[PDB]
Amino acid sequence: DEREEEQRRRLEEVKEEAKRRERSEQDLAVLYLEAVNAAVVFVADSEEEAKRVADIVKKLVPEVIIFVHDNFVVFVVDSDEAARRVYEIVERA
Amino acid sequence: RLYWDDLKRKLSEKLDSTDFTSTIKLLNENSYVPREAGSQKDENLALYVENQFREFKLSKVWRDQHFVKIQVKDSAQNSVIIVDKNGRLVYLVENPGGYVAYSKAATVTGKLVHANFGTKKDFEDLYTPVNGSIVIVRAGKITFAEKVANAESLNAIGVLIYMDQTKFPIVNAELSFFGHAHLGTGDPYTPGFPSFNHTQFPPSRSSGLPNIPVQTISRAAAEKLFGNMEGDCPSDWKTDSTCRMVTSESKNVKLTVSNVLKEIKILNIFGVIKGFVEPDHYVVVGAQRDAWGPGAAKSGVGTALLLKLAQMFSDMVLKDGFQPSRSIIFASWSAGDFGSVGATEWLEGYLSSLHLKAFTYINLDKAVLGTSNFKVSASPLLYTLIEKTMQNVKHPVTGQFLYQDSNWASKVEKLTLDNAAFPFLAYSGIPAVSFCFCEDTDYPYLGTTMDTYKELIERIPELNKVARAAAEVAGQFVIKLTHDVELNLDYERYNSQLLSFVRDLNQYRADIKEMGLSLQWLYSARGDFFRATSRLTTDFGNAEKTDRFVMKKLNDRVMRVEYHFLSPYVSPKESPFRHVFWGSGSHTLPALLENLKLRKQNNGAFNETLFRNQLALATWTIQGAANALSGDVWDIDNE
Amino acid sequence: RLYWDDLKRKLSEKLDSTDFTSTIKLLNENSYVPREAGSQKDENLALYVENQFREFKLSKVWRDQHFVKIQVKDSAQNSVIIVDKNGRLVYLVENPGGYVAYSKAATVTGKLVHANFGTKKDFEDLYTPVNGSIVIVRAGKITFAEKVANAESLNAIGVLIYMDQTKFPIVNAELSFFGHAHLGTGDPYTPGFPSFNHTQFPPSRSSGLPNIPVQTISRAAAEKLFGNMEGDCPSDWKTDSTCRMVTSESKNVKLTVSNVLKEIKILNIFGVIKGFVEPDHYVVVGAQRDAWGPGAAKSGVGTALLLKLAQMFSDMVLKDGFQPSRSIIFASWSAGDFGSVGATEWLEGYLSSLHLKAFTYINLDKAVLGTSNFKVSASPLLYTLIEKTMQNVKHPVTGQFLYQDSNWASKVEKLTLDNAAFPFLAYSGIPAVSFCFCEDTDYPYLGTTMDTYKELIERIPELNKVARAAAEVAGQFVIKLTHDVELNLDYERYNSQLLSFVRDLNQYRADIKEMGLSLQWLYSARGDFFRATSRLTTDFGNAEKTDRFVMKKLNDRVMRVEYHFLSPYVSPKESPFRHVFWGSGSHTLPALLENLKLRKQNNGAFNETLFRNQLALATWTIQGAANALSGDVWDIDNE
């Protein structure tokens, strides 16, 4: 699906615009969240932890749309139920 | 070909033409009361049940003979006496008529300290320590065995049990009652192996046997003891005004228990209606036959329900064309008053034959104790089956459906040690269910000589209609479990359970974080189990129900769900209740949570290595259950 | 439709055009030797085997990752030194190149006492006690772990192991060799549970880990030690003339072992050919891939056989129309030199998936060690399958059939701790088989740097034909187990076993009579088991093989035979080898026999209560196996 591609490229442009100022990782996480109307943005220490958390969330929440971008993970959902479940999983795992 | 609606309508039709009260009244005749385990009248009722099973023309009627050790009263009378520490007077408080089976025979003298119910929280919130003193407790919240174990954990030397009037509004203050204090089930002198002659009965004692004397006393004796005690009992205990806390400095209590062991022969009566497609898989329906006194509510109701259900299902199969796919076993147990001894020893004797064959147990004991509430305790695999049953069975009095609370499943209490379904669920891994029409209070005459038919028919004038409703619930359970090609066992329910587990872990996150541990593997196992259940439901949906082979594979995978939650890392002889959800011991999830709870209290009660092993073994039990449910071994995905 | 004769002839046809020596020599190239567990070359060979499985177009190829703890050599060199008790002289005997894994790191000094082989009979029939002294033993009859355990049971402080020239005719007297001393299988630091990250590796040590240092030495070092020792070694030991018994009064031995633990990643490579009727049931074929040195005979032969068998069966399925009803799993294990760690941890990880699904294991390790004798060690359920295989498979040299002794089954020795089929049989209850073309002596280069292709092809010039014959035996096993609707598992064999058991009891009649016990229940259980096997054979005869479901039920009853001999009263974590016939621990029949043996020999070693519990539990294990094999629970004729 090319729409997910265009969203990834939007996240890349947002990364550049964050690159222009001196931002913290959480500021860039908030920018990622607001850019693609995400529900949860988790910034891992490595790409491996990012993939692992994303796979756990996808197993527990199938309807979520996950974007792994460097060590950032972007969770986009269609309902508030999935948002709450994804938040609980990411916060407690 | 009959479908679910036809079977429901014919079942209700036969329930309308059934007289339960007549059989209850027959079970309370003088030829059957009292029926202590192994007594002559117990054998008479066993023979009557056997002849009824034969007259119903079941597929096969048989029996099992066991030789078990119980405890009975000795010629020497147990006594509760008050001694003055000056030595000038001794006062016989009571020579009780009842007793507590499996109590240790000893004489102990010391202070008498009142504990509310004998629970651990009652003991912790106590002003006076109980070490070296005798404890007096009320019955009602936990089993006698749990009270005695909690007392022994704090080095108490004796336990007295009484029935206060607030919890037991009995006019007769001198009423005696009976119980047992074995922290377990089955014959306590054959722990983990059947009580058969083949074993030649080797010397082995269950670890749940208490080491202090415990005795039941009347309320009059309790008030006589309170007369020699000081301190008001707390208001939140909600007991009688005569209640007191600790004996005076000048008064001590002497408790003398001299009960003796007795080897008896018990009979388990069985009837079987064979299935028409898969007769090797079966449901078990059981009821306790023995009772200390008359046991109308404790034993008569359940036995009458068993007889009526067997008769009605035999008539439906022989005359109404009912063709159950799987078999149905009706069981009359004995020695249930001593801790479900008959059922537990039957399970231990035929575990190898029941493995992945018996897929549901339905207990009928104490199913009619009132009319206000309908209470159920079962494995989650049956929850859906209960819900659908509660949504079309009407209350015997109000006429409404039993399904009134949509959040009932989140308020279910797990099966307890005194319930006969507990060894089925926790030891043999068979989904079990117990249910009852009851009140918010306990039936006051259980274990007493006033548990007669008169008291039952007086407290419940609609006894016939309530018994009919209980029999309808049980019969709908049986029909749903045996009539179709699908088992109606809801594996997805366990997902909810797992969620609760990790949520219960959240309140200790900080502890988990400072020990260098993570909960990520548990969440991954939850994801694997949820996906496996989803894949199984999808496969059931896409399968052809007439294709017996695909249905056979999927149903075998269903029948392995409860078994895979039995802990594979513990000795079944020393820890028979292996179920990590509903068993007892350090291998269960509640035990893990209690051990983890001890880490906040910064004293050395927390055991870190034990907790690490508990977490590892529970994590892999859950993960292995998910892997086994996912399919073949090569189709398991690992990160 | 292909029948047994067509499949056998096609198997032999494909075996004729197969080059085994080329694959063995390829496994001995420098990119694969040496391949200690977890090393880079071990992983290279794992990747090669995985890609070969992929090129064979198997049904599915996958892998498993384990993190296990092994023991390796330290920078500090282990040493054997001789010290003169006249503090004026010390003599460095040897800095050995090999080592014994899982030995305790310690330095011990004391007398050196010679035990013949480290067996219990060698230690008991010894003039000089070994308590507080170092023991030197020859290898060959029992595992290193058994030697160290027997020495530690008598309070020895150290163990030295060497290879005498009489039992090991090696020209190089300074040759080093390697072993392990863990009395068990699998990762000794995850005892009873898989070595997966999900467990988060809690602190747990196997009870089989020794507590004394043990070190391997060359024959030259052993002779240097004998130079400082006195007393001739007994003639029946049949060892070198340089052998001596005890050190002189002035000389002591100092042993220094400093091995270190190391956590490594091991890979288990798997390929599966799915069945055509019941793909959920499968046979497992395994071979060890790792080795301390080059491991040509200990690891190369088995891996080459695994590769060739997988290739040949994939070709038979894809092009020759071979349609196995059940699946076939080919497994390349790692860390086999440390006690079948890979296979044991795979079993412990996927027990829930293998339960009543994997019905036979075939081990290929050390299948070619000679040409004189053909030896087999297996569960009785495979004995018939072995016999029919020996009656039509020809010896690679003589050309005669392997079936020459009609009483071979009465001379089969049970699987030992060092065999990878032992955890399959004793722990997971899967019928297992190991076989080899060997000599009366042991292969002298096992565990040494001389286990190369040069020595193997020189000692066995017909290596290709012997490997072809071993592959033919394994392939006929697989075909007989997967081609027909019946499993070809002979349950009736166990009848004989039970007879032997009770006959072994006869020599203690008086003991059984003096303890007030009887053997009548054992004979009744024997009769019940014989009845169950006879009716199962009759039902197989009267059933129609085209009826998929009756055959499925009977085959399920067959597949439950081995599982029901696993002790259900023992903890699988602390005593994983639960099989009462072929396991280890107080729950086995040999342990019962040894305990009963201690009653005649009137020391205080006999434990009467333990013996009574053993007799009860074994009797009911046998009786429950018979009851489960007899059919439904209501069709058991017990009274």
Ligand SMILES: *[C@@H]1O[C@H](CO)[C@@H](O[C@@H]2O[C@H](CO)[C@@H](O[C@@H]3O[C@H](CO)[C@@H](O)[C@H](O)[C@@H]3O)[C@H](O)[C@H]2NC(C)=O)[C@H](O)[C@H]1NC(C)=O
């Ligand atoms: C219930 O447990 C308590 C606590 O162990 C028992 O009271 C203890 O009794 C012993 C001897 O009677 C006391 O030992 C003495 O302690 C004082 C403390 O100042 C010390 O100075 C003396 O040298 C002597 O060791 C102990 O202190 C005392 N503990 C308390 C808190 O008073 C009590 O006896 C137990 N109940 C029964 C019925 O045995």
Ligand SMILES: *[C@@H]1O[C@H](CO)[C@@H](O[C@@H]2O[C@H](CO)[C@@H](O[C@@H]3O[C@H](CO)[C@@H](O)[C@H](O)[C@@H]3O)[C@H](O)[C@H]2NC(C)=O)[C@H](O)[C@H]1NC(C)=O
């Ligand atoms: C299976 O085990 C049970 C329980 O151990 C055996 O029943 C018990 O058998 C003994 C000895 O036969 C009975 O004791 C005897 O009682 C009579 C009558 O008072 C007395 O004359 C003898 O001197 C002896 O004391 C005991 O009463 C009996 N127990 C019960 C509850 O019946 C049974 O015999 C065993 N069955 C087999 C086939 O071995």
Ligand SMILES: *[C@@H]1O[C@H](CO)[C@@H](O[C@@H]2O[C@H](CO)[C@@H](O[C@@H]3O[C@H](CO)[C@@H](O)[C@H](O)[C@@H]3O)[C@H](O)[C@H]2NC(C)=O)[C@H](O)[C@H]1NC(C)=O
């Ligand atoms: C905290 O829990 C751990 C784990 O249960 C306790 O460690 C355990 O201690 C017992 C007794 O010290 C050990 O029992 C041993 O059993 C083997 C079985 O073969 C036997 O050979 C030994 O002689 C001994 O009886 C057990 O191995 C050990 N378990 C572990 C995992 O270390 C510990 O004692 C507990 N701490 C406290 C303060 O209670």
Ligand SMILES: *[C@@H]1O[C@H](CO)[C@@H](O[C@@H]2O[C@H](CO)[C@@H](O[C@@H]3O[C@H](CO)[C@@H](O)[C@H](O)[C@@H]3O)[C@H](O)[C@H]2NC(C)=O)[C@H](O)[C@H]1NC(C)=O
């Ligand atoms: C291997 O075990 C033997 C026997 O246990 C050890 O020999 C014994 O060593 C003890 C020293 O603790 C000797 O006990 C001593 O006996 C004398 C005379 O009776 C007494 O006066 C002392 O107070 C002390 O109890 C004992 O006699 C001796 N012999 C026997 C036959 O017991 C031997 O040392 C052990 N080997 C080692 C530790 O390398």
Ligand SMILES: *[C@@H]1O[C@H](CO)[C@@H](O[C@@H]2O[C@H](CO)[C@@H](O[C@@H]3O[C@H](CO)[C@@H](O)[C@H](O)[C@@H]3O)[C@H](O)[C@H]2NC(C)=O)[C@H](O)[C@H]1NC(C)=O
């Ligand atoms: C699953 O468990 C294994 C076993 O512990 C984990 O592998 C180990 O991970 C640690 C990381 O804390 C590695 O330590 C690292 O060692 C390398 C060189 O060896 C060094 O460069 C690093 O600075 C760090 O000290 C350790 O080597 C590694 N063990 C092996 C045998 O590779 C693994 O990470 C765990 N997996 C997960 C997903 O948690």
Ligand SMILES: *[C@@H]1O[C@H](CO)[C@@H](O[C@@H]2O[C@H](CO)[C@@H](O)[C@H](O)[C@H]2NC(C)=O)[C@H](O)[C@H]1NC(C)=O
């Ligand atoms: C004889 O065997 C019995 C049974 O194994 C042993 O009894 C054990 O005793 C220990 C403590 O000594 C307890 O922790 C166990 O619970 C007992 N086991 C059982 C099954 O009750 C007894 O120790 C042995 N006797 C000797 C001298 O070794």
Ligand SMILES: [Ca+2]
């Ligand atoms: Ca028992």
Ligand SMILES: [Ca+2]
């Ligand atoms: Ca293990």
